[PDB]
Design a protein around this ligand. Structure first.
Ligand SMILES: NC(=O)c1ncn([C@@H]2O[C@H](CO)[C@@H](O)[C@H]2O)n1
Ligand SMILES: NC(=O)c1ncn([C@@H]2O[C@H](CO)[C@@H](O)[C@H]2O)n1
Length: 1580
């Protein structure tokens, strides 16, 4: 049945003694035990398919039986002759193999009892902390100094004073203040050459060196006095352009000092007088009157007043101005990172009235200068007691100079993210603080101020301000370590943790190097003290305290997790260096591979070797062997049901037996990282044909090769000598030629310039430098990065024997559908036959992970043949239908487990329940890979030959894998070992003294390569754990498991003799024994549990995120909240706004509070405007340009691609998405122009014909009479916008770097430059161009259709070429000429769109149709129009109970089928706006090639000269609007031919080829019920 097709030609091959390697023999020979012998394991493993015999075709059965008989012939075991002997032997095997699980149960019990009596029993957490300090003092002697005057800087490297006086005037004020007599007073850190030197340096730089100026602020010194030069050089010597000092965790003077620091911070912050700015404008637009963001404003008022009060407190406490100053000064420092030298400096001054900094040439060293009045000076001294060198008195003011500080680039970027980080932290902390919220509810907006707060509310505001300041501008690594510790140390309120005290004793790093992190340390210590002191309302009985913000009297448990994980997730990632980060990413496989090699006893030099017969139930790297086979056999028998139907479904859906370019994974523009090296023959021929008479005439690659060999000879002569010896016979001739070239003297040599040699030179120089430097009788390769769409083209050319491209060779074969094609598996076996030949094993090379095309195809085969095996398991959740399925399957697991326990607890003896939420420690490095070949062999889906191919792929992948080091990292490591170390770590042990580029890694299969097979093996291990647990005699067990890669969510319900079973398992609780038994079983199955980020509980489940307790979920919206303010795509403004509006929509879907949404809007808009299109008050705005030109559009009607602001209403944003604002403004303008009231009215008017023509004619008459109106001008502007333009596009697209200078790197362009000569590389051009279009117009399928077969792919790639760290770059690109400017480009563009123009009926009516015809819009808008505000079981509660009722629950009773009021939503992809742009582009390129053909055959094309029929029909199509006429024709024509490529050409030329060949037209969409996955906890 189902026509089982042989999808290979390896039918004669067998898994044993036919493949290249013999490792299967020793794999079988390593599985012999004392009771299972050689013939039994051979019989079971090579004939276990007999259980899958009632759903197999006869050809499949005969092929597998022949494979069994053959494999037993090579494996010297006499096989059985008929199937009956096979079945009898298999029932004997199933009995004796069944007698193993009691032995495994006794083994895991003995392992638990062995692991019990070894670890520790520590009394409490205070003793654990004291012990951890004791071992840290034992490792490093005499730390934890008691003198606080030698710690590090406290207030980061930025110190902002509020200012009272109202850009060169500030610098002149400082210059006139600095001219008084010297009365300086030096300061002690916690109660002096450096202060004197920095005072003299600042005094000189202010008085005498300021007025050779550049860019109005940057100036240097050359013609100065010798005394001034001495002062400047002493200042630069102070600049400098284990010795750690720590403090103990239980200090008290540090607490008192930190309290004084907090009060002085608050009284310093409450002094500002400014009231206008850039950040203030956008945040006040979004939060001062946020009622424009709602539709039903009157039903909630206290939330809006609370948001207004929070914004008023932000305005009062100078939060916006502090964030603005931080952003502008970080931008100025990033600009100051420039080619300016060490003798120049810059004066940074923002709109702050009297704050200055001096920036000099690891980071940027700088000094800050401040003016402080006599009112608040001692509080300034208390604040900055660590960071004040000098101060003096002038008039009624004090002048303060701070210490030099250094900033890195990513640190300046994190300072640049301050206006997005800080105000949302303040808003959510003030929202979550209970007594602050009740005080804000008590007071009215006219009366809130600091002076009328009580002591407690004042203190909690001080703590909130301090926490927000120290969280939003985090720079140093101590806070990173503290927040990582608090991330990993929140597991104490639960039953069993195994990291409550051992984690603190072992892995906690007490790296407290300064003050005011002790506040966070004592906060988390007090929380853990309360937790150890001993739906669910939390804090009403425990009376818990928040860690950062203290925040007493917590209402629910939902706030603690949200605030703590907000502090966790709002931290920057790469505060470590880029080179060090790549070293860390490349170095961990070296450690975890050499550990494996040294433990198993392999040495460095020898081969990988498959089996040392030590893979029998050991601890480090082993499996049980004879148990995994039985577990996989039972898993396959219980999972796979219909082999033939499943195989046919694989071949149909996953597209086996299809051409390779039809695979979407192997077609899209990714990178394959092939190896390409400049040829040694090319190098020696360049050296041979280099002419000494042409020393000045050398240009290009010859000059690059000459400079490379000159540098190689200058650095290392002997290696070049032996390279010439082994690569040329005339080595003396080459040496004397090189000597004559270096004695000519017309070339330039260089010294060791580190990374600059690769930075400012041609790549060929450094490639020939590396190749001539590292010749060690091998071929060192550096991987390039080619596209996969250009390797597939070369592979097809190689497969079809077209090594060199000919124009007639492609055209000979491939006429229509019946031409020559190929399939993916014949391609794959041709690839394997090519790769099995000796080629130096360059095919298997991984560079940081970029795997080759060959390996990509092989893991595509493995992963997509195991994907459908993974799809049939209901307890397995990697094959999900989106992110909804994970949460849905998790909550079905939890509620069915709770239901089964509630059933079981009635009338039973005893019953216990325990959950486990585990993450595995190292899923890739510590794992074994030879356990996977076993899972390949008993696969019943495959036949003989495909399983052998799979085994060949896995064995070659394991045995031949290597990892190559990048060039700059390799050179830096080499020079570091050469000049400092003369030795290296394990990365320099795998590589022979760093004399090799590649180091081998085999048993660590790389992350993400094998995702489905590993999860399948994890689920098999879980089922084997259940089968082991079932063998206990006195108790009844039930286990349920959820499996994702590197994850596990288990639960177990036990009944029976509970006290006896816990005494046997040697633990006091069911979570404790569950943790120990899962650890023992996973250790038996070569899976290493992580003992710190894993816990066993009785009520809480955490799969990947959003932990759920007792059937009720904690929402966890802080991930989206930190994502919106931290992470952005950084490609353009429109795309970043759309991509973060997706995150705003998701945050609205996850149930956030009301007060955070306007601040989130402000955060995304501040980020987008601050990077790309400058926030208002300066150049490159859009509202300023629209106001200057007098454009008819308003401030809130500008589209986002034109620079407009996101002003979508919240419910359409949540339901539709980021395109809803463009759709809404378009629909509003249509309704305003057509003088209609409703969507139904305008649809009924448009649907009747002879209407829009009449409107266009009367609008033309109005334009002729000059009686245009405001709505008419808006209509003309948007009509032109759609004509010259998700619905819309970027319009102004700034071109990237011109890669036409690198198009010679691409093989399709190289083939296009050969069969067509250099006339068309960049009268012969006319006739060649004419030949190109008549061979293009004879084949419309090539340029209209994605490739049906061959002669539709490679010549399409030829013919498509016819006719025409990163944050600093695009913060400077806008302020540059790329030529003209962006602002004048927008000026010229809008001046072009402002005119009426003619022949715009096509764009007008297509805009009208595309806006009106959308089904989701046409159903959503009347529901939003006619929704009653409250009551009738809709609005009852107020605690975030309108972000859940009026959003989406009426939306789902709307689009329909449901009844919920409160649920967390995971939405479908119902809205699609791309059902017309694809045929628009297809018919656009159709008219493009038609117009170019007719313009080539003659000029002035208005009507043709009656050529052929296709030319006549394309003339008729281009006479009118071609797209509009073909849409109007297909409105009633309904041909829909069968696409045989012969009858379509028979029927009619133009219209069938360019209407139906897109497989459809604009048809009606489909609407779903939004897929409410799971409830929230209901409130009423
Ligand atoms: N004139 C130069 O070549 C120059 N100027 C500055 N540096 C760098 O300054 C550091 C030494 O002070 C090294 O990193 C150099 O590369 N080099
Ligand atoms: N980026 C991450 O979130 C990450 N990185 C590593 N790990 C896990 O944490 C362990 C080390 O603590 C590793 O073995 C991984 O399982 N998690």
């Amino acid at each position: 049945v189902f026509f089982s097709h042989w999808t290979s030609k390896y039918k004669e091959r067998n898994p044993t003694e036919i493949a290249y390697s013999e490792d299967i023999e020793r794999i079988i020979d390593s599985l012999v035990t004392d009771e299972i012998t050689k013939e039994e394991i051979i019989h079971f493993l090579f004939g276990n398919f007999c259980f899958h015999i009632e759903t197999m075709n006869d050809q499949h059965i005969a092929d597998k039986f022949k494979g069994y008989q053959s494999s037993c012939i090579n494996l010297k075991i006499e096989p059985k002759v008929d199937l009956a002997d096979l079945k009898d032997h298999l029932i004997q095997k199933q009995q004796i193999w069944e007698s193993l699980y009691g032995k495994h149960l006794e083994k895991i019990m003995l392992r638990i009892r062995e692991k019990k009596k070894k670890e520790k029993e520590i009394p409490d957490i205070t003793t654990a902390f004291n012990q951890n300090a004791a071992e840290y003092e034992e490792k490093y002697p005499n730390c934890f100094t008691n003198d606080l005057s030698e710690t590090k800087t406290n207030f980061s490297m930025t110190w902002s004073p509020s200012f009272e006086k109202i850009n060169n005037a500030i610098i002149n004020k400082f210059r006139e203040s600095f001219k008084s007599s010297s009365r300086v007073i030096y300061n002690s850190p916690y109660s002096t050459n450096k202060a004197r030197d920095i005072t003299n340096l600042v005094r000189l730089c202010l008085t005498e060196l300021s007025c050779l100026t550049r860019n109005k602020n940057e100036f240097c010194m050359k013609e100065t006095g010798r005394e001034n030069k001495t002062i400047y050089f002493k200042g630069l010597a102070v600049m400098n352009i284990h010795m750690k000092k720590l403090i103990r965790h239980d200090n008290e003077d540090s607490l008192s000092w930190c309290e004084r620091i907090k009060d002085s911070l608050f009284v310093l912050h409450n002094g500002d007088i400014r009231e206008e700015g850039k950040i203030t404008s956008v945040y006040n637009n979004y939060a001062k009157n946020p009622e424009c963001l709602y539709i039903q404003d009157s039903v909630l008022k206290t939330e809006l007043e609370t948001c207004k009060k929070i914004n008023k407190l932000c305005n009062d406490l100078a939060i916006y101005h502090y964030s603005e100053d931080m952003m502008q000064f970080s931008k100025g420092l990033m600009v100051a990172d420039r080619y300016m030298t060490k003798e120049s400096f810059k004066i940074l001054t923002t709109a702050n009235t009297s704050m200055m900094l001096l920036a000099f040439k690891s980071g940027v060293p700088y000094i800050a200068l401040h003016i402080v009045d006599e009112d608040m000076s001692d509080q300034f001294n208390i604040c900055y007691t660590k960071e004040i060198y000098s101060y003096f008195r002038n008039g009624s003011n004090y002048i303060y100079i701070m210490r030099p500080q250094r900033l890195n680039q990513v640190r300046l970027l994190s300072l640049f993210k301050t206006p997005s980080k800080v105000p949302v932290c303040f808003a959510q902390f003030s929202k979550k603080a209970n007594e602050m919220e009740k005080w804000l509810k008590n007071k009215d907006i006219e009366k809130v101020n600091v002076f009328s707060m009580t002591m407690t509310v004042k203190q909690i505001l001080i703590n909130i301000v301090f926490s927000s300041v120290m969280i939003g501008t985090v720079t140093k690594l101590s806070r990173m370590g503290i927040f990582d510790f608090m991330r990993y140390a929140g597991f104490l309120p639960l039953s069993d943790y195994s990291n409550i005290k051992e984690y603190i004793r072992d892995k906690f790093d007490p790296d407290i190097t300064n003050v005011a992190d002790i506040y966070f340390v004592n906060g988390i210590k007090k929380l853990l003290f309360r937790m150890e002191d001993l739906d669910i309302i939390g804090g009403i009985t425990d009376l818990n305290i928040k860690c950062p913000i203290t925040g007493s009297t917590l209402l629910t448990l939902e706030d603690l997790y949200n605030n703590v994980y907000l502090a966790i997730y709002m931290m920057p990632k790469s505060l470590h260096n880029h080179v060090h980060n790549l070293t860390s990413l490349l170095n961990v496989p070296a450690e975890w591979e050499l550990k494996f090699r040294k433990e198993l006893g392999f040495n460095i030099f020898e081969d990988i070797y498959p089996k040392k017969a030590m893979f029998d139930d050991k601890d480090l790297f082993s499996i049980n062997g004879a148990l995994n086979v039985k577990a996989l056999s039972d898993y396959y028998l219980g999972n796979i049901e219909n082999v033939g139907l499943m195989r046919s479904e694989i071949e149909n859906k996953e597209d086996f037996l299809s051409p390779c370019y039809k695979i979407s994974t192997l077609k899209s523009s990714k990178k394959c990282s092939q190896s390409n090296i400049i040829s040694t023959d090319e190098i020696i021929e360049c050296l041979q044909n280099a002419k000494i008479q042409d020393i000045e005439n050398w240009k290009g690659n010859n000059l690059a090769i000459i400079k490379g060999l000159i540098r190689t000879y200058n650095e290392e002569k002997n290696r070049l000598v032996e390279f010439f010896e082994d690569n040329c016979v005339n080595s003396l001739y080459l040496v004397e030629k090189l000597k004559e070239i270096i004695n000519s003297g017309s070339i330039t040599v260089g010294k060791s310039v580190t990374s600059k040699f690769i930075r400012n030179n041609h790549p060929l120089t450094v490639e020939t430098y590396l190749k001539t430097k590292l010749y060690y009788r091998n071929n060192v390769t550096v991987l390039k990065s080619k596209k996969v769409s250009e390797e597939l083209y070369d592979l097809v050319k190689q497969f079809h024997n077209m090594m060199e491209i000919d124009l007639d060779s492609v055209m000979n074969l491939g006429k229509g559908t019946e031409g020559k094609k190929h399939t993916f598996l014949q391609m794959l076996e041709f690839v394997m036959s090519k790769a099995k030949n000796v080629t130096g094993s360059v095919d298997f090379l991984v560079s940081v992970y970029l795997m080759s095309m060959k390996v990509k195809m092989m893991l595509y085969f493995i992963e997509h043949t195991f994907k459908h095996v993974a799809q049939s398991d209901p307890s397995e959740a990697i094959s999900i239908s989106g992110d909804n399925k994970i949460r849905a399957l998790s909550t079905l697991s939890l509620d069915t487990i709770t239901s089964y326990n509630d059933i079981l607890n009635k009338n039973s003896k005893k019953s216990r329940l325990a959950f486990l939420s585990a993450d595995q420690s190292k899923w890739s490095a510590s794992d074994l890979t030879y356990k996977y070949v076993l899972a390949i062999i008993l696969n019943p889906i495959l036949t003989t030959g495909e399983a052998s191919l799979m085994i060949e792929c896995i064995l070659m992948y394991v045995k031949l894998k290597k990892v190559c080091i990048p060039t700059d990292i390799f050179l830096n490591l080499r020079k570091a070992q050469g000049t400092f170390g003369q030795n290296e770590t394990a990365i320099g042990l795998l590589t022979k003294g760093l004399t090799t580029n590649t180091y081998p890694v085999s048993m660590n299969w790389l992350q993400g390569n094998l995702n489905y097979l590993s999860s399948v093996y994890h689920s098999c291990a879980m089922k084997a754990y259940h089968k082991t647990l079932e063998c206990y005699k006195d108790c009844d067990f039930q286990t349920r498991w959820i499996v994702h890669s590197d994850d596990n969510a288990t639960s177990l319900i036990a009944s029976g003799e509970v006290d006896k079973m816990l005494t046997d398992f040697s633990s006091s609780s069911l979570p404790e024994m569950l943790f120990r038994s899962i650890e023992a079983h996973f250790k038996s199955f070569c899976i290493t549990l992580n003992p710190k980020k894993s816990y066993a509980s009785s009520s809480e489940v955490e799969f990947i995120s959003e932990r759920i307790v007792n059937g009720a979920i904690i929402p966890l919206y802080c991930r989206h909240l930190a994502n919106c303010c931290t992470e952005s795509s950084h490609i353009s403004y429109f795309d970043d706004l759309m991509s973060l509006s997706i995150h705003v929509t998701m945050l609205l879907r996850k149930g956030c509070p009301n007060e955070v949404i306007p601040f989130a809007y402000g955060a995304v808009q501040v980020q987008a405007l601050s990077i790309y299109s400058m926030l208002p008050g300066e150049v490159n705005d859009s509202i300023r340009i629209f106001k200057k030109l007098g454009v008819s559009l308003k401030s809130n009607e500008i589209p986002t691609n034109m620079g407009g602001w996101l002003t979508s209403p919240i419910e359409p944003l949540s339901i539709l998405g980021p395109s809803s604002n463009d759709q809404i403004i378009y629909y509003n303008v249509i309704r305003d122009f057509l003088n209609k009231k409703s969507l139904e009215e305008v649809k009924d008017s448009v649907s009747s014909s002879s209407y829009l023509q009449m409107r266009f004619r009367e609008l033309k008459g109005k334009y002729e009479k000059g009686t245009l109106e405001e709505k008419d001008k808006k209509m003309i502007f948007l009509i032109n916008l759609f004509e010259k333009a998700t619905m819309l596009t970027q319009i102004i697209k700034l071109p990237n770097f011109i890669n036409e200078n690198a198009l010679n790197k691409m093989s399709s362009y190289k083939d296009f430059s050969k069969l067509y000569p250099n006339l068309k590389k960049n009268i012969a051009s006319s006739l060649e161009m004419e030949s190109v279009h008549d061979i293009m117009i004879k084949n419309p399928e090539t340029i209209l259709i994605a490739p049906l077969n061959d002669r539709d792919f490679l010549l399409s790639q030829l013919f498509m070429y016819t006719s025409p760290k990163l944050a600093l770059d695009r913060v400077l690109r806008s302020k540059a000429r790329t030529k003209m400017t962006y602002e004048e480009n927008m000026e010229k563009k809008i001046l072009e769109m402002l005119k009426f123009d003619l022949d715009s009926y096509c764009s007008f009516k297509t805009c009208v149709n595309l806006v009106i015809k959308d089904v989701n819009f046409s159903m959503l808008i009347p529901i939003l129009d006619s929704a009653y505000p409250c009551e009738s079981r809709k609005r009852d509660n107020y605690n975030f109970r309108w972000f859940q009722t009026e959003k989406w629950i009426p939306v789902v009773e709307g689009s329909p089928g449901l009844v919920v009021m409160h649920a967390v939503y995971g939405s479908n992809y119902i809205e699609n706006l791309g059902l017309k742009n694809i045929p628009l582009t297809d018919d656009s390129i159709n008219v493009l090639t038609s117009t170019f053909g007719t313009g080539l055959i003659m000029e002035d094309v208005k009507s043709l000269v009656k050529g052929k029929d296709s030319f006549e029909t394309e003339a008729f199509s281009n006479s009118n609007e071609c797209q509009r006429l073909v849409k109007a024709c297909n409105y009633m024509i309904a041909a829909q031919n069968r696409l045989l490529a012969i009858n379509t050409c028979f029927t009619r030329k133009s219209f069938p080829f360019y209407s139906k060949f897109n497989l459809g037209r604009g048809f009606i969409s489909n609407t779903l019920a939004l897929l409410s996955t799971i409830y929230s906890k209901e409130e009423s």
